[PDB]
């Protein structure tokens, strides 16, 4: 905005901001598309994997990643970045599991990667974060969907987004909520999240995506995280495709 | 440095044609007080091994959930696991062998004997030792702790060599373990008639075979035996 404040994420503006914090927000846009539904008895992911050429390996690149076993994320933004953030979130799980013997509840999750963000905004010589996760799961305590901005700031949602095609994914998302106050049941929000992914393609139509979905569920996949795969895959593509046309 | 506290006592084990076969007794023994009833040796990891652990139930629940973490760990990065990069018993062993040794080195023994048994997705039958001395090697048939000096020979009648595994099958073996049992359970004071037999195959998959009984029982020859050795 003004000179000064920007260079290192630890001096104020007068207005009460941090330009480079804001820096981080606006970083996140030029990344791909991610959303989440979340569900009754189920969590679902969905991701906008672009392709830049015919020459990629098609369903051998992924933003999906695992944490546990019963916590997905997928990340929008910058990918190497994404990953460093995914690596800690393992780090995270992994200490939990020692000491209680039990797998993280989403709320511990959510406290201990919103600190380790916040605290690389908190400092001279580090770098803010340029990454946002949208991530969650199921749990001893139902299911939970949370969005991480790269401030270190969270909330939970039942329809969450982030990236390019985030201005077509929430207003979808709130038209969900609307027509279904029920929520959606696990099965259906696969392919509706299909739909949402192929409509928020219309600000990315430029070059050719993939679409990966993956899920937590409850009542179908009995807590775990496992990704949707195969025949399961190809009629929430062949429903999204009928729908947009 | 540690000493045992409570301890299983014998993983019995031996190969056949088609896979592999693991048991132990269920039990965990406070020395001459036999404390823990239930205590479970056999811990699935993967779904193509089975390790089995005897020696200190205080370090067998630290490896327990050392192994946990492995199958958590081949899940991590890979965008699938189940035939890609999928864990094999061979792999589990060299996990293990290097940490029971690198403990030795700092001196705080793991006090424990372990027996992978497995198959790999290779068709290759799989079966080795590693102990607290960080001692390993690969032989055909194992057993541990009092179970080396007591039920071992019988198993290798059964198969003493390795080109008599196509002349066993899978009821066959099956009978030896369980006669192999039978006997720690006479002759053994930290065998209990609780026991567990896993049967990892390279075709059937696992069959994990949970509180069997101790059956062929002889002890109606007792009453014959009058006195110490003189006595009417």
Same mark, same amino acid.
């Given at each position: 905005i003004?000179?000064?404040?920007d ?5 104020f503006? /007068? #207005?009460?901001?941090?330009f ?5 927000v606006?970083?996140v846009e030029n990344?791909t598309?991610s959303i989440?539904?979340?569900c ?10 672009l392709?830049t050429?015919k020459?990629?390996v098609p369903?051998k690149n992924v933003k999906?990643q695992?944490?546990?076993?019963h916590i997905?994320?997928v ?5 190497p970045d994404?990953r460093?953030?995914?690596n800690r979130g393992?780090?995270e ?8 013997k039990?797998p993280?509840?989403?709320?511990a999750?959510?406290?201990?990667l919103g600190?380790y963000?916040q ?7 580090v770098r803010?974060?340029?990454?946002s996760?949208?991530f969650?799961?199921?749990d001893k305590?139902?299911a939970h969907?949370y ?9 939970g949602?039942?329809?969450?987004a ?6 077509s994914?929430?207003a979808?998302? =709130?038209?969900?909520v609307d027509?279904? /106050? =029920?929520?959606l049941?696990?099965?259906?929000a696969?392919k509706?999240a299909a739909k949402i ?15 990966e %979905?993956?899920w937590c569920?409850?009542?179908?996949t009995?807590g775990?995280?496992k990704?949707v795969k195969?025949?399961l895959?190809?009629?929430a593509i062949?429903?999204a495709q009928?729908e %947009?046309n | 440095?540690?000493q /045992? %506290?409570?301890?299983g ?7 056949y ?5 693991i048991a132990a007794?269920?039990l965990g023994?406070?020395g ?13 990891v993967?779904?193509?091994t089975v390790?089995g652990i005897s020696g200190?139930i ?5 490896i327990?959930?050392?192994?946990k973490?492995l199958?958590? =760990?081949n899940?991590?990065?890979? /965008?699938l ?5 999928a ?10 062998a290097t940490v ?10 793991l006090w424990? !004997?372990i027996?992978?048994?497995?198959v790999?997705?290779?068709?290759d039958?799989?079966l080795?030792?590693?102990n ?7 032989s055909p048939?194992?057993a ?7 039920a071992?020979?019988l198993?290798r ?7 008599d595994?196509?002349k066993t099958?899978?009821?066959? !073996?099956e009978?030896?373990i369980?006669?192999?049992?039978r ?7 930290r065998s209990s008639?609780?026991?567990?037999l896993? %049967?990892?195959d390279k075709?059937?998959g696992?069959?994990?075979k949970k509180?069997l ?6 002890? #109606?020859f007792a ?6 050795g003189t006595?009417k």
């Amino acid at each position: 905005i003004g000179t000064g404040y920007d260079l290192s994420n630890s001096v104020f503006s /007068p #207005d009460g901001r941090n330009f480079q914090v804001e820096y981080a927000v606006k970083a996140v846009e030029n990344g791909t598309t991610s959303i989440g539904i979340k569900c009754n008895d189920g969590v679902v992911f969905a991701v906008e994997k672009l392709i830049t050429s015919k020459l990629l390996v098609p369903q051998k690149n992924v933003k999906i990643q695992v944490v546990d076993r019963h916590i997905g994320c997928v990340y929008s933004g910058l990918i190497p970045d994404g990953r460093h953030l995914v690596n800690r979130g393992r780090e995270e799980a992994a200490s939990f599991k020692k000491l209680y013997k039990t797998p993280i509840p989403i709320p511990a999750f959510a406290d201990r990667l919103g600190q380790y963000v916040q605290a690389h905004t908190l400092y001279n010589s580090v770098r803010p974060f340029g990454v946002s996760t949208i991530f969650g799961g199921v749990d001893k305590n139902g299911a939970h969907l949370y969005m991480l901005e790269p401030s270190g700031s969270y909330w939970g949602y039942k329809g969450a987004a982030t990236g390019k095609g985030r201005q077509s994914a929430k207003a979808e998302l =709130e038209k969900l909520v609307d027509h279904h /106050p =029920e929520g959606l049941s696990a099965r259906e929000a696969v392919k509706q999240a299909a739909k949402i992914i192929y409509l928020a393609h219309e600000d990315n139509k430029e070059k050719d995506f993939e679409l990966e %979905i993956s899920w937590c569920s409850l009542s179908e996949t009995n807590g775990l995280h496992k990704f949707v795969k195969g025949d399961l895959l190809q009629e929430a593509i062949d429903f999204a495709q009928k729908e %947009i046309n | 440095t540690q000493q /045992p %506290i409570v301890t299983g006592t014998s993983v019995i084990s031996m190969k056949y044609d088609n896979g592999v076969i693991i048991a132990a007794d269920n039990l965990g023994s406070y020395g001459s007080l036999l404390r823990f009833n239930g205590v479970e040796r056999l811990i699935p990891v993967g779904d193509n091994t089975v390790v089995g652990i005897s020696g200190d139930i205080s370090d067998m629940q630290h490896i327990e959930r050392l192994l946990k973490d492995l199958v958590t =760990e081949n899940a991590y990065d890979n /965008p699938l696991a189940d035939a890609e990069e999928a864990l094999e018993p061979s792999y589990i062993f060299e996990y293990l062998a290097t940490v029971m040794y690198q403990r030795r080195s700092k001196m705080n023994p793991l006090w424990n !004997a372990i027996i992978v048994a497995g198959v790999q997705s290779n068709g290759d039958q799989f079966l080795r030792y590693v102990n607290l001395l960080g001692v390993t090697y690969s032989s055909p048939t194992l057993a541990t702790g009092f179970g080396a000096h007591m039920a071992n020979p019988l198993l290798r009648k059964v198969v003493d060599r390795e080109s008599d595994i196509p002349k066993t099958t899978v009821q066959v !073996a099956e009978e030896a373990i369980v006669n192999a049992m039978r006997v720690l359970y006479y002759r053994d004071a930290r065998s209990s008639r609780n026991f567990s037999l896993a %049967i990892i195959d390279k075709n059937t998959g696992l069959t994990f075979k949970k509180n069997l009984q101790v059956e062929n029982m002889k002890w #109606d020859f007792a009453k014959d035996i009058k006195g110490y050795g003189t006595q009417k």
